[PDB]
């Protein structure tokens, strides 16, 4: 006689150990995972062979840690099923007994969909007994790899796929993933070498806009393991010289836990938290190369060998800007050296823009940071160039309502419109280049 195994693949986003009873748990309200491919293997002979020297929990553990040691995972006759849209996948008609013993079956996730890490290789030793079960329901868990932007200037923010930023903003990002359940295991059929020799986390942006600041924390099970790890693991950022040697990305970092000077101490630490969720957090600074009309996302790649990776995309960021064309009234003649300050309202209070890193700039202003002051004489005096289509541009601005205040006309002219109210449109240069006239004075 036989038994069926019904798998219900589900998403894991946290630490948990749901003891599989064997029963159907109805509608659990968990998110299913589609496209997971499972193989099944009869490990009965192998299990009872081990059961001579080790107890059942230990024997089961040994096969779980090193399943490829006990079965040929590459077998073409090994029954295979892929999980449907409801997470469902069934192996049917498996022998309930094998060479006179109650059968023991192993399950291996051969193909894990993006962006998930595999369910641990599970084993089921029969029977599962009724007060036996013919259909045994299992609930294998795929750990979702995530990347989120969590804070801006050390303040929490709503999780969005698109954020509006200002130059000088410090962005906190978090990449989350699972330490493998078999991280500490040795390689299949090798008593001296290890199973994992690479635990690489590669975060990068293809477009300019961020400067790497710091690796802020590495958390697991509410423990900051960054201190214990540091020096013993490989790490580099785009601020380092040897970044450019392997990658040509503007921004990023590559963190290998097992690529450092002391992989074995690291592996030992990781083994204490095997199966648990690690948060790697880091800060970046929005810089003068962050331009409008340009969404800029990052990508994180978790990999345990050269030939595969779990890839995930973080949110995009964008910044605002504005163009003005200061001209002679009644013509397209561009007027250099007209003077403005930038104003916004904060409640019913005028604040004025102070720009950092803009000595030497006239016409195009691309600051490293913008702060705001109620002292109007401290405001950065912006000057126009003689350029043809627009002779005053500002970028790195949050969207919203501003006023360009003309504080001095260019020589030979008088101010026509002192205040010029305008709007920064999120992520763009704005609807149009705003024209500002100055009237010439017939000097004698």
Residue numbers in the entry: 37 to 167, 171 to 483
Publication text:
So-called major pilins polymerize head-to-tail into the pilus backbone, with ancillary pilins added at the tip (adhesin) and base (anchor). The L. rhamnosus GG genome also carries the genes for another pilus operon called spaFED9. The tertiary organization of GG-SpaD is a tandem assembly of three Ig-like domains, wherein a middle domain (M-domain) joins together the N- and C-terminal regions (N- and C-domains) of the pilin subunit.
In the orthorhombic crystal the three domains are arranged linearly with an elongated shape 125 Å in length. This we call GG-SpaDC for the closed conformational state. The N-domain shows the atypical K–D isopeptide bond, involving the uncommon YPKD pilin motif. In the structure of the N-domain there is clear continuous electron density between Lys45 and Asp181 within the C-terminal region of the first (A) and last (G) β-strands, which indicates the formation of an isopeptide bond in a trans configuration. Catalytic Glu145 from β-strand E is situated in close proximity and forms a hydrogen bond with the O moiety of the K–D isopeptide bond. The side chain of Lys180 points outward from the core of the CnaB fold into a cavity formed by the extended and hook-shaped AB loop. Residues Glu52 and Arg66 form a salt bridge between the two ends of the AB loop, and thus cover Lys180. The two GG-SpaD molecules in the asymmetric unit for the closed conformational state are stacked linearly head-to-tail, with the C-domain (tail) of one GG-SpaD subunit docked into a groove-like hydrophobic opening in the N-domain (head) of the neighboring subunit. Also located in the groove of the N-domain is the linking lysine (Lys180), which lies within covalent bonding distance of the C-terminal LPXTG-motif threonine (Thr487) in another pilin subunit. The interface between the C- and N-terminal regions of adjacent GG-SpaD subunits encompasses a surface area of ~765 Å2, with eight hydrogen bonds and two salt bridges.
